[PDB]
Design a binder for these strands. Structure first.
Lengths: 98, 98, 50, 98, 147, 103, 50, 98
RNA sequence: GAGACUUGGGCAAUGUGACUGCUGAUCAGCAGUCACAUUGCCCAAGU
RNA sequence: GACUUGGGCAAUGUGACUGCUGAUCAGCAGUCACAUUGCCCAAGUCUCUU
């Protein structure tokens, strides 16, 4: 609204976005549990969630390229715990895939 | 309001201690809405659904603790006794309580 | 007297009915109300009631 | 009689009716305004209430002339999300509540 | 007869929820009418305009607490002419800006010829401790309620 | 949270009996210490009594508008307990608390 | 256009405007979708010569 | 031999409206080093700017609407005395002279 | 085509739980305003 | 000298009515979280298909 130049706004946006633009073009981010499912080699075996109080735990066992590592996701909602466990399994798999 | 719950608990304990009042008496209490929890155990859930007024009218509870709600025009079974534990404040309060 | 100095984060300003006298934030007022009611119960009905 | 009824009722702040028969009452104005303010916050954090303020004698003079001498006036500041940013003032009433 | 053909309904106001419920049960047992019930405990605000209309088309008598009916009439879901009677239990509370007196104030705004019959009910006529000079209190009450 | 974990195993109607139900080994020497008047200062008495029950201290500075710092103390035991006052009184407050509970 | 609207109504009416059904109903009376190439072209079984 | 830094004292005495919002907490932030305390006699420029900005936020954070004079009055030499004591000291002076 | 599995965009509700906000009345304290009663004093008149 | 009327100045009170503060109680509204089982679309991986 101030500059009223699309090129200037584009310059500002690119200056703000360059590291993420470079990183994401090299490796496109996708949904974490969808990524884990699309990594069929891991075969993520998520157990059914259980609830204690108002917090829900989801336990997962996935083949981390050498072992069936067991991880637990904790969150206020069943999907929240699902996502937490999925992301933690993904980071463990990434560390093993060094 | 809190006086209702407090005296309800005291009456429960006193009735249960005495051998005479043990069987004859059965207390029950009420305040307005924002209904305070009728339990002292801090349990997350209570399954009970029957109203206190129905228990009183049906003869389930024959000793009703009430606060400025059961005073106005509440039709009930033939009540042999009425106790005004706190001093009367207003003319209409006295009239309706009588 | 300890709680009046708690310095909770920013809270809605509370004032009297005609808006000249200030009041404590809702949480402090609620805690004080509970304790005052307990004191009233103890004073009026006895130790067992408390 | 009509005379006594009119004299007893129609002497305080006048009511308002629109072109569709809907009736707005002075005692319900505060409730209506607070209810409307509760609907506008887009998130659970941005809850905000109207800012009532009482003008001082110098302000009373500068805004209303001499006619406001000895009568209270209340300035109300609407939250930023709403249409209003004009700090509506009330007419000089005999008391701050009115 | 339906509301659009001039149908009329009957209100039965009350001050407390339990009293309103008991009176609703009493009317239900003593008459053949399908009486309504409207209190803020369960929530009535979602009973919106069109379904206010189908509710009043469904029920003949409305038994509930004062504030719900006051909000209904002020927002003009139903006109005063669409009522035949207005019964107010414990009418001795109708002073100052109490919803009973507010409702009776709302009465004077509408056409005077279309006002329903008002039947206040009470076992006591004095509100506060100003039991002296009862005559002024009675004149105030009989000016509030139009009888 | 480092706290807020209730594993005392006692009903809330009787959880206050936690300090009463310890072994006599800690209790007798702790009450002897808290009843001893020769102590150098209230802080020293508080620290010695708290160490007697093997309960570790945890003192942090709560933000406040008071010029004198408003300090809170956490005991870190299985029983979730927290006390707070002016630092000139927190030690005597601990004295009073453990004097009341330990019987 | 609606400069003074609340943002919630603005995004709701935006979603209605960018809704699939609105774009559809624009294109039906735009008379365009009659020419879309969508069938998997098979001349022997799903096409007629001129 | 001890005093407040000379720059902050000058700010305190020359800016009464900014003075009235200074709280003891803002003084607690001024953990001046050995050089500032002993040799220079006042806080550094960066510390001075940090103090003024912290107090500017102090005037608008939770601390707003409070009065800190009861704790920071001694720093500038102000003290609050009841009117009774001020009368009694004069009267006792008459007593001692008599 | 038959399907299983996941994230979504949602549409529904059966729960249930807690939060927040406001109106009204009553009492108590304080402040102020209306009228009225009692004991006086004095004056104005008329016969 | 009785009789009558009226007014004014006093004090001693009473009856209420508002205004402010605090407390108590009833009365409404806006929400939010979230287990449970359902329904319709969008894109995915795999058996089969091939």
């Amino acid at each position: 609204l101030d500059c009223r130049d699309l090129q200037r706004t584009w310059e500002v946006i690119f200056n703000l976005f360059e590291p993420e633009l470079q990183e994401f073009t090299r490796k496109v981010p996708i949904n974490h549990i969808r990524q884990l499912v699309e990594h069929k080699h891991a075969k993520p075996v998520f157990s059914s969630p259980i609830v204690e109080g108002e917090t829900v735990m989801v336990s997962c066992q996935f083949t981390c390229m050498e072992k069936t590592i067991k991880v637990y996701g904790f969150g206020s909602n069943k999907d929240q715990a699902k996502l937490s466990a999925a992301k933690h399994a993904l980071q463990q798999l990434s560390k093993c895939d060094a | 309001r809190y006086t209702c719950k407090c005296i309800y608990g005291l009456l429960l304990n006193y009735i249960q201690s005495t051998p005479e009042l043990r069987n004859v008496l059965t207390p029950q209490f009420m305040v307005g809405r924002n209904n305070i929890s009728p339990d002292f155990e801090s349990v997350l859930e209570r399954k009970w659904q029957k109203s206190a007024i129905q228990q009183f009218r049906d003869g389930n509870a024959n000793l009703m603790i009430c606060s400025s709600v059961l005073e106005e025009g509440i039709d009930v079974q033939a009540c042999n006794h009425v106790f005004i534990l706190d001093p009367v404040k207003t003319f209409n309060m006295y009239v309706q309580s009588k | 007297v300890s709680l009046d100095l708690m310095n909770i984060g920013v809270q809605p300003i509370r004032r009297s009915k005609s808006l000249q006298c200030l009041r404590d934030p809702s949480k402090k007022s609620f805690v004080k109300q509970l304790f005052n009611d307990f004191l009233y119960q103890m004073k009026e009905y006895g130790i067992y009631a408390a | 009689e009509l005379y006594e009824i009119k004299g007893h009722f129609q002497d305080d702040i006048d009511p308002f009716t629109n072109e569709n028969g809907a009736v707005l009452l002075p005692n319900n104005a505060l409730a209506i305004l607070h209810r409307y303010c509760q609907t506008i916050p887009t998130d659970a954090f941005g809850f905000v209430i109207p800012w009532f303020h009482v003008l001082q004698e110098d302000e009373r003079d500068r805004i209303f002339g001499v006619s406001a001498k000895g009568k209270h006036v209340i300035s109300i500041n609407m939250p930023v999300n709403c249409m209003l940013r004009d700090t509506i003032y009330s007419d000089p009433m005999d008391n701050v509540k009115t | 007869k339906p509301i659009e053909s001039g149908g009329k309904r009957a209100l039965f106001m009350c001050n407390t929820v339990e009293l309103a419920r008991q009176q609703a049960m009493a009317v239900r047992r003593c008459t053949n009418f399908k009486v309504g019930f409207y209190v803020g405990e369960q929530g009535v605000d979602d009973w919106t305009r069109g379904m206010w209309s189908d509710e009043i088309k469904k029920n003949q008598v409305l038994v509930g607490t004062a504030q719900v009916f006051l909000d209904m009439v002020t927002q003009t879901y139903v006109a005063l002419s669409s009522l035949s009677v207005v019964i107010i239990d414990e009418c001795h509370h109708g002073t100052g800006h109490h919803p009973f007196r507010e409702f009776m104030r709302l009465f004077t705004i509408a056409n005077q010829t279309k006002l329903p019959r008002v039947v206040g009910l009470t076992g006591v006529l004095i509100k506060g401790n100003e039991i002296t000079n009862v005559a002024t209190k009675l004149k105030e009450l009989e000016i509030t309620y139009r009888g | 949270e480092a706290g807020s974990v209730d594993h005392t195993g006692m009903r809330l109607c009787d959880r206050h009996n936690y300090f009463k139900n310890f072994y006599p080994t800690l209790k007798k020497e702790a009450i002897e210490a808290i009843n001893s008047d020769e102590y150098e200062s209230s802080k020293d008495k508080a620290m010695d009594v708290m160490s007697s029950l093997k309960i570790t201290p945890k003192i942090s500075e709560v933000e406040s508008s008071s010029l004198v710092p408003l300090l809170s103390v956490e005991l870190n035991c299985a029983f979730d307990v927290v006390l707070m006052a002016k630092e000139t009184d927190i030690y005597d407050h601990i004295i009073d608390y453990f004097r009341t509970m330990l019987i | 256009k609606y400069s003074d609207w609340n943002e919630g109504t603005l995004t709701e009416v935006k979603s209605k405007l960018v809704s699939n059904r609105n774009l559809l109903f624009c294109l039906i009376d735009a008379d365009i979708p009659k020419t879309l190439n969508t069938i998997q072209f098979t001349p022997r079984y799903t096409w007629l010569p001129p | 031999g001890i005093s407040l830094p000379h720059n902050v004292l000058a700010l305190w005495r020359e800016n009464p409206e900014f003075a009235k919002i200074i709280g003891p907490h803002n003084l607690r932030d001024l953990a001046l080093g050995d050089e500032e305390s002993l040799v220079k006699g006042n806080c550094s420029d960066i510390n001075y700017n940090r103090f003024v900005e912290g107090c500017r936020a102090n005037g608008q954070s939770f601390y707003a609407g409070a009065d800190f004079s009861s704790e920071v009055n001694f720093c500038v030499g102000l003290v609050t005395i009841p009117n009774k004591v001020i009368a009694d000291t004069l009267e006792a002076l008459l007593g001692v002279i008599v």
